[PDB]
Amino acid sequence: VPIAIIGTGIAGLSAAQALTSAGHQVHLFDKSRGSGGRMSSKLDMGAQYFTARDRRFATAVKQWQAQGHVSEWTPLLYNFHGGRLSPSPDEQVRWVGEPGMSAITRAMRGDLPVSFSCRITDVFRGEQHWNLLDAESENHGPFSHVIIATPAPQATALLAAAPKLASVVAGVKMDPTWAVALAFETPLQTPMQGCFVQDSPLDWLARNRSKPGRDDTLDSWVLHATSQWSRQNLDASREQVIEHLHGAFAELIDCAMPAPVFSLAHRWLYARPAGSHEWGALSDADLGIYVCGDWCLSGRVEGAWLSGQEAARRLLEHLQ
Amino acid sequence: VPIAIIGTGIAGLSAAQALTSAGHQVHLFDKSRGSGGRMSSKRSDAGSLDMGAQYFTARDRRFATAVKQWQAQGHVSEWTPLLYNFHGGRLSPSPDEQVRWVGEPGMSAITRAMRGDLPVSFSCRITDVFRGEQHWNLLDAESENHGPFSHVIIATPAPQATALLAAAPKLASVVAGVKMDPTWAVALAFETPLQTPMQGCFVQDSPLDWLARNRSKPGRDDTLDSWVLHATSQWSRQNLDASREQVIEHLHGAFAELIDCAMPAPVFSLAHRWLYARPAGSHEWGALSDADLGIYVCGDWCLSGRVEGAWLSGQEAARRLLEHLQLE
Ligand SMILES: Cc1cc2nc3c(=O)[nH]c(=O)nc-3n(C[C@H](O)[C@H](O)[C@H](O)COP(=O)(O)OP(=O)(O)OC[C@H]3O[C@@H](n4cnc5c(N)ncnc54)[C@H](O)[C@@H]3O)c2cc1C
Ligand SMILES: Cc1cc2nc3c(=O)[nH]c(=O)nc-3n(C[C@H](O)[C@H](O)[C@H](O)COP(=O)(O)OP(=O)(O)OC[C@H]3O[C@@H](n4cnc5c(N)ncnc54)[C@H](O)[C@@H]3O)c2cc1C
Ligand SMILES: NC(=O)C1=CN([C@@H]2O[C@H](COP(=O)(O)OP(=O)(O)OC[C@H]3O[C@@H](n4cnc5c(N)ncnc54)[C@H](O)[C@@H]3O)[C@@H](O)[C@H]2O)C=CC1
Ligand SMILES: NC(=O)C1=CN([C@@H]2O[C@H](COP(=O)(O)OP(=O)(O)OC[C@H]3O[C@@H](n4cnc5c(N)ncnc54)[C@H](O)[C@@H]3O)[C@@H](O)[C@H]2O)C=CC1
C-alpha cells in the first residue's frame, strides 16, 4: 500500500525520491496540471536561480548537473539604488535548471505515479490506512502514510487529524509576490542581465536569454515585485500589475524599450515565508503524517529539498 | 460594498440575518448546492430525510424567541415522539421533560427561510481569503475572484476555517487547535411500516447512539417508512474509511438487533459521512475575530456544538462587527 505525497514541488519530490530510493511506492497529488510548484511547471516566472550552501544539498546539485538538469548561471548583475543603476559584480555561484527551472522537479518526478488537477481537501485515517478526499468528493486511498508538502497556509487544511501540528503550521506566515514577464522581438540594448532593485515596486529582474540553454528567439524578462508592493496590490488585475511593473522597469532601464510581443503576470499568495525556521520537518510518527516545505527551514530551494529529505528520513525510520 | 459570509449553515445565516436587520448588505457563499449545512435535509426516493441534525433544544432565551417566530411562521414544530432507550440489551420507554423542535416539513425549512432572497453563490468553494489595501477578496476553487467585500465572516467547521484565515495566522492557530468528531448516518426505508410504537431511541453499548422515525415528524412524505440512524463518534472513527455499503450493513444490523418487531429488507438505504460533525469539546468564545483587519469567525464550535450554539455564534460575530464600524 503506497505512501501519499500531497504537493509536487521540490519538497514533495525530494521526499518522493528518498522513499523510492529506499524501495517504497508513492503516489503523488497536485491540484495543479503539472509538477514544480513555485519552481514553475514544464520563462521561469517563479524561482529564478538557487545557491547551495549545505553540503548535502550541494551534493544533490552535482547529481542534477551530471544528469543535465542544472547549469551554472553567471549573469552580469546590477543594482538599482537611489534612482541609479550600477554594475554589482560578485563571486556567488548561482544555479539554474536547464533548460528551465522546471526541469529539476520534472526529472525528480520522472514516472512516479501522480494525480494532477486533484485538489486534496481532507486527510483522515481509519484504524489502519489513510484516505484523501479531493475537491470533487472522490476518495483516494488506502495509503500507509501521508506526507504534506504544501505551503504552510495550504497544509493547515490537511492536518485536521493532528490539530496540534495544524496549530503550529497555521502560525507560519507566507508573503505574496506578483511576477510579470515581458518579451521583446528586438533585444533591449543593455548589457544588464539581472538587477537587484531598491526603492521600487520591483526588487528583482532577470533576462532569460542570459541563462544557459534557453531559447534566444525573443528577449524575455522576468520582473518580481516586492512583498510589500505585492500586498498593497494583492487584488489588482493582471493587466494593472503588468502596467505598473512594466512601468517600473521602463523607469530604471537605461535604454529604449519597444512594445512587447506578449506580457504575462502571475500571483503567488504564498510566495515565501516571512521568517526562518529550523524545524526541518514536522511529524506525527504515531499517526503516520509528516509535513515538509521550504518554510520548515530557510524558504529557498535548498530549504525545500532539505525539508523533504528530513520528512522521508523520519518516515523511513518509523517504517520499522 | 457588502460583507462576505462563507458558510450557509445556521451560524452563517444567523450572522446574515442580524447584519441585514441592521441595514447592512451581505453576500453568502457555500460550496454545496444548497444551504443548511449540517441541518440540511436530503431529497430522495424515500422523501426528505434529516440525515444531519435530527431535532434541537432551545435553552437560551434569545434563541427560544427565534424558534418561536419560526414556529409561528410554520417552519418548526414541537416534536413529541414516543422516545425509547436501548441499554443493556433491552428496549424501554424513555419519556422526559425536554422540549424538542424539528423543522417542518423538513429540518432544512428553517435555514431556508432564514436565507430567503439574500444574495448567495452556491457551488462555490472558497479556498483563499485575502485583502488588498481597502477590500477583502475570496478566491474559489475555479480560481475565480470574488469581491470587493468590506469584511469577511467565516462560518464553517473549524478545520475548514483554518485555510481561510491565512490573513490572520494568530487567529488561524487558535482555530486549527479545535478538534471535531466524525459521524456516520444511515437511512433505511420500508414499504410496510414497522409494527412498533417507537418513534425515536437513544442507544447505548452500540454502534448506534440514535435513531428516529420520519413518519413521526410533521409534514413528511409517508409513502415509505423511513428511519435515520446515527452512529457514535467512537464507532464512526473506528470505521471512518468504511464503504457506504459496509456502514449500511453494520448499522442496519445494529438496528435489527434492537427492534421489537419484525423487520423486512428495506426498499431503500443511504449512508452519509460527516468528518466534522460536532466539536469534540465545548468552548465559550462565542465568536473569534481580528476586527482591526475585518475578519470574523463563527460556528457551533465557538460554543456548545448544537443548533443553538451555532445560531448564537453567528449572532455574536455580527454584533461584534457592527460595534466595530464606528472605529473604522
Ligand atoms: C516569485 C518567486 C521567486 C522565488 N525565487 C527564488 C529564488 O530566486 N531562489 C530560491 O532559492 N527560491 C526562490 N523561491 C522559493 C522557491 O521557489 C521555494 O522555496 C520552493 O520552490 C518551494 O518548494 P516547496 O516544495 O516547499 O513548495 P511548492 O513549490 O509551493 O510546491 C507545493 C505544491 O503543492 C501543491 N498544492 C498546494 N495545495 C494543495 C492541495 N490542497 N492539494 C494538492 N496539491 C496542493 C501546489 O500546487 C504546489 O505544486 C521563489 C518563490 C517565488 C514564489
Ligand atoms: C450527523 C449529525 C447529527 C447532528 N445532530 C444534532 C442534534 O440532534 N441537535 C443539535 O443541536 N445539533 C446536531 N448537530 C449539530 C448541528 O447540526 C450543528 O451544530 C449546526 O447545524 C452547525 O451549523 P454551522 O452553521 O455552525 O455549520 P454548518 O452547518 O457545518 O455549515 C457550514 C457551511 O459551510 C460550508 N462550507 C464549508 N467549507 C466551505 C468553503 N471552503 N467554501 C464555502 N463554503 C464552505 C458547508 O458547505 C456548510 O454549508 C448534528 C450534526 C451532525 C453532523
Ligand atoms: N520573490 C520571492 O518570492 C522569493 C525570492 N527569494 C529570493 O531568492 C534569492 C536567492 O537567495 P540566496 O540563495 O540567499 O541568494 P543570494 O546569495 O543572491 O542572496 C540573496 C540576496 O543577497 C543580495 N545580493 C546578492 N548578490 C548581490 C549583488 N551582487 N548586488 C546586490 N545585492 C546582492 C540581494 O539583496 C538578494 O536578495 C534571493 O534574492 C531571495 O530574496 C526567495 C524566496 C522567495
Ligand atoms: N453522533 C451523533 O449522534 C451526533 C450527535 N449530536 C447530538 O446533538 C445532541 C444535542 O443534544 P441536546 O440539544 O442537549 O439534546 P438532548 O437534551 O436530547 O441531549 C442529548 C443527550 O442527552 C441524553 N438524553 C437526553 N434525553 C434522554 C432520554 N429521554 N433518554 C435517554 N437519554 C437522553 C443522551 O445522552 C443524548 O445524547 C448532542 O447531545 C449529541 O447527542 C451531535 C453531533 C453528532
PDB file of N, CA, C and O in Angstrom, chain B residues 67-94:
ATOM      1  N   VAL B  67     -36.880  30.658  17.695  1.00  0.00           N
ATOM      2  CA  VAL B  67     -37.552  29.394  17.414  1.00  0.00           C
ATOM      3  C   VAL B  67     -39.053  29.607  17.409  1.00  0.00           C
ATOM      4  O   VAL B  67     -39.750  29.027  16.588  1.00  0.00           O
ATOM      5  N   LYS B  68     -39.551  30.398  18.344  1.00  0.00           N
ATOM      6  CA  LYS B  68     -40.993  30.704  18.390  1.00  0.00           C
ATOM      7  C   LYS B  68     -41.519  31.483  17.198  1.00  0.00           C
ATOM      8  O   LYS B  68     -42.665  31.306  16.792  1.00  0.00           O
ATOM      9  N   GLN B  69     -40.698  32.388  16.677  1.00  0.00           N
ATOM     10  CA  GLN B  69     -41.018  33.098  15.454  1.00  0.00           C
ATOM     11  C   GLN B  69     -41.107  32.101  14.326  1.00  0.00           C
ATOM     12  O   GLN B  69     -42.046  32.120  13.523  1.00  0.00           O
ATOM     13  N   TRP B  70     -40.127  31.207  14.261  1.00  0.00           N
ATOM     14  CA  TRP B  70     -40.162  30.197  13.228  1.00  0.00           C
ATOM     15  C   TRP B  70     -41.377  29.301  13.350  1.00  0.00           C
ATOM     16  O   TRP B  70     -41.961  28.891  12.354  1.00  0.00           O
ATOM     17  N   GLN B  71     -41.715  28.961  14.583  1.00  0.00           N
ATOM     18  CA  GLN B  71     -42.912  28.174  14.860  1.00  0.00           C
ATOM     19  C   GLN B  71     -44.148  28.895  14.339  1.00  0.00           C
ATOM     20  O   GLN B  71     -44.982  28.307  13.660  1.00  0.00           O
ATOM     21  N   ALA B  72     -44.279  30.171  14.673  1.00  0.00           N
ATOM     22  CA  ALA B  72     -45.455  30.929  14.264  1.00  0.00           C
ATOM     23  C   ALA B  72     -45.485  31.090  12.739  1.00  0.00           C
ATOM     24  O   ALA B  72     -46.551  31.252  12.159  1.00  0.00           O
ATOM     25  N   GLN B  73     -44.323  30.967  12.085  1.00  0.00           N
ATOM     26  CA  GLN B  73     -44.246  31.076  10.607  1.00  0.00           C
ATOM     27  C   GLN B  73     -44.498  29.724   9.965  1.00  0.00           C
ATOM     28  O   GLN B  73     -44.600  29.631   8.741  1.00  0.00           O
ATOM     29  N   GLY B  74     -44.566  28.671  10.779  1.00  0.00           N
ATOM     30  CA  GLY B  74     -44.787  27.334  10.238  1.00  0.00           C
ATOM     31  C   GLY B  74     -43.548  26.580   9.813  1.00  0.00           C
ATOM     32  O   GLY B  74     -43.649  25.587   9.096  1.00  0.00           O
ATOM     33  N   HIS B  75     -42.371  27.008  10.251  1.00  0.00           N
ATOM     34  CA  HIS B  75     -41.160  26.348   9.768  1.00  0.00           C
ATOM     35  C   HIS B  75     -40.585  25.409  10.798  1.00  0.00           C
ATOM     36  O   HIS B  75     -39.656  24.650  10.496  1.00  0.00           O
ATOM     37  N   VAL B  76     -41.143  25.416  12.006  1.00  0.00           N
ATOM     38  CA  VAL B  76     -40.715  24.458  13.014  1.00  0.00           C
ATOM     39  C   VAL B  76     -41.886  23.967  13.821  1.00  0.00           C
ATOM     40  O   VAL B  76     -42.928  24.633  13.930  1.00  0.00           O
ATOM     41  N   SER B  77     -41.738  22.787  14.403  1.00  0.00           N
ATOM     42  CA  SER B  77     -42.804  22.336  15.269  1.00  0.00           C
ATOM     43  C   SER B  77     -42.201  21.662  16.454  1.00  0.00           C
ATOM     44  O   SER B  77     -41.092  21.130  16.384  1.00  0.00           O
ATOM     45  N   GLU B  78     -42.968  21.622  17.541  1.00  0.00           N
ATOM     46  CA  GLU B  78     -42.527  20.872  18.688  1.00  0.00           C
ATOM     47  C   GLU B  78     -42.734  19.422  18.272  1.00  0.00           C
ATOM     48  O   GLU B  78     -43.801  19.033  17.791  1.00  0.00           O
ATOM     49  N   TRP B  79     -41.753  18.592  18.575  1.00  0.00           N
ATOM     50  CA  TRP B  79     -41.808  17.177  18.211  1.00  0.00           C
ATOM     51  C   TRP B  79     -42.007  16.414  19.486  1.00  0.00           C
ATOM     52  O   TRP B  79     -41.232  16.608  20.423  1.00  0.00           O
ATOM     53  N   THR B  80     -43.029  15.558  19.508  1.00  0.00           N
ATOM     54  CA  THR B  80     -43.342  14.778  20.684  1.00  0.00           C
ATOM     55  C   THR B  80     -43.418  13.260  20.371  1.00  0.00           C
ATOM     56  O   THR B  80     -44.479  12.638  20.394  1.00  0.00           O
ATOM     57  N   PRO B  81     -42.278  12.677  20.009  1.00  0.00           N
ATOM     58  CA  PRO B  81     -42.178  11.245  19.732  1.00  0.00           C
ATOM     59  C   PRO B  81     -42.278  10.425  21.009  1.00  0.00           C
ATOM     60  O   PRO B  81     -41.905  10.871  22.101  1.00  0.00           O
ATOM     61  N   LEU B  82     -42.732   9.204  20.851  1.00  0.00           N
ATOM     62  CA  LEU B  82     -42.545   8.216  21.888  1.00  0.00           C
ATOM     63  C   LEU B  82     -41.072   7.834  21.789  1.00  0.00           C
ATOM     64  O   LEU B  82     -40.631   7.198  20.821  1.00  0.00           O
ATOM     65  N   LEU B  83     -40.299   8.301  22.768  1.00  0.00           N
ATOM     66  CA  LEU B  83     -38.873   8.097  22.775  1.00  0.00           C
ATOM     67  C   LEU B  83     -38.610   6.907  23.636  1.00  0.00           C
ATOM     68  O   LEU B  83     -39.213   6.750  24.686  1.00  0.00           O
ATOM     69  N   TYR B  84     -37.647   6.108  23.210  1.00  0.00           N
ATOM     70  CA  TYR B  84     -37.265   4.880  23.890  1.00  0.00           C
ATOM     71  C   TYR B  84     -35.768   4.959  24.212  1.00  0.00           C
ATOM     72  O   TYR B  84     -35.047   5.861  23.746  1.00  0.00           O
ATOM     73  N   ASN B  85     -35.323   4.062  25.070  1.00  0.00           N
ATOM     74  CA  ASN B  85     -33.904   3.930  25.353  1.00  0.00           C
ATOM     75  C   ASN B  85     -33.470   2.476  25.145  1.00  0.00           C
ATOM     76  O   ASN B  85     -34.225   1.552  25.446  1.00  0.00           O
ATOM     77  N   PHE B  86     -32.276   2.278  24.578  1.00  0.00           N
ATOM     78  CA  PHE B  86     -31.772   0.899  24.440  1.00  0.00           C
ATOM     79  C   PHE B  86     -30.469   0.768  25.212  1.00  0.00           C
ATOM     80  O   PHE B  86     -29.527   1.510  24.968  1.00  0.00           O
ATOM     81  N   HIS B  87     -30.470  -0.133  26.193  1.00  0.00           N
ATOM     82  CA  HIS B  87     -29.447  -0.147  27.229  1.00  0.00           C
ATOM     83  C   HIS B  87     -29.368  -1.551  27.795  1.00  0.00           C
ATOM     84  O   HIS B  87     -30.398  -2.111  28.202  1.00  0.00           O
ATOM     85  N   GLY B  88     -28.176  -2.139  27.784  1.00  0.00           N
ATOM     86  CA  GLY B  88     -28.020  -3.471  28.325  1.00  0.00           C
ATOM     87  C   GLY B  88     -28.958  -4.453  27.660  1.00  0.00           C
ATOM     88  O   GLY B  88     -29.565  -5.302  28.314  1.00  0.00           O
ATOM     89  N   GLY B  89     -29.140  -4.281  26.358  1.00  0.00           N
ATOM     90  CA  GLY B  89     -29.921  -5.218  25.577  1.00  0.00           C
ATOM     91  C   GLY B  89     -31.431  -5.187  25.698  1.00  0.00           C
ATOM     92  O   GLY B  89     -32.093  -6.057  25.138  1.00  0.00           O
ATOM     93  N   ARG B  90     -31.999  -4.187  26.363  1.00  0.00           N
ATOM     94  CA  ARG B  90     -33.452  -4.094  26.391  1.00  0.00           C
ATOM     95  C   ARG B  90     -34.002  -2.726  25.975  1.00  0.00           C
ATOM     96  O   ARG B  90     -33.396  -1.675  26.190  1.00  0.00           O
ATOM     97  N   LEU B  91     -35.154  -2.774  25.317  1.00  0.00           N
ATOM     98  CA  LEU B  91     -35.842  -1.568  24.851  1.00  0.00           C
ATOM     99  C   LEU B  91     -36.844  -1.162  25.906  1.00  0.00           C
ATOM    100  O   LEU B  91     -37.694  -1.975  26.291  1.00  0.00           O
ATOM    101  N   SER B  92     -36.785   0.096  26.332  1.00  0.00           N
ATOM    102  CA  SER B  92     -37.766   0.633  27.256  1.00  0.00           C
ATOM    103  C   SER B  92     -38.073   2.113  26.966  1.00  0.00           C
ATOM    104  O   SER B  92     -37.195   2.877  26.517  1.00  0.00           O
ATOM    105  N   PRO B  93     -39.311   2.522  27.232  1.00  0.00           N
ATOM    106  CA  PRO B  93     -39.678   3.920  27.042  1.00  0.00           C
ATOM    107  C   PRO B  93     -38.788   4.872  27.829  1.00  0.00           C
ATOM    108  O   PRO B  93     -38.391   4.547  28.944  1.00  0.00           O
ATOM    109  N   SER B  94     -38.466   6.029  27.257  1.00  0.00           N
ATOM    110  CA  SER B  94     -37.639   6.970  27.965  1.00  0.00           C
ATOM    111  C   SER B  94     -38.237   8.375  27.863  1.00  0.00           C
ATOM    112  O   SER B  94     -37.634   9.254  27.289  1.00  0.00           O
TER     113      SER B  94
END
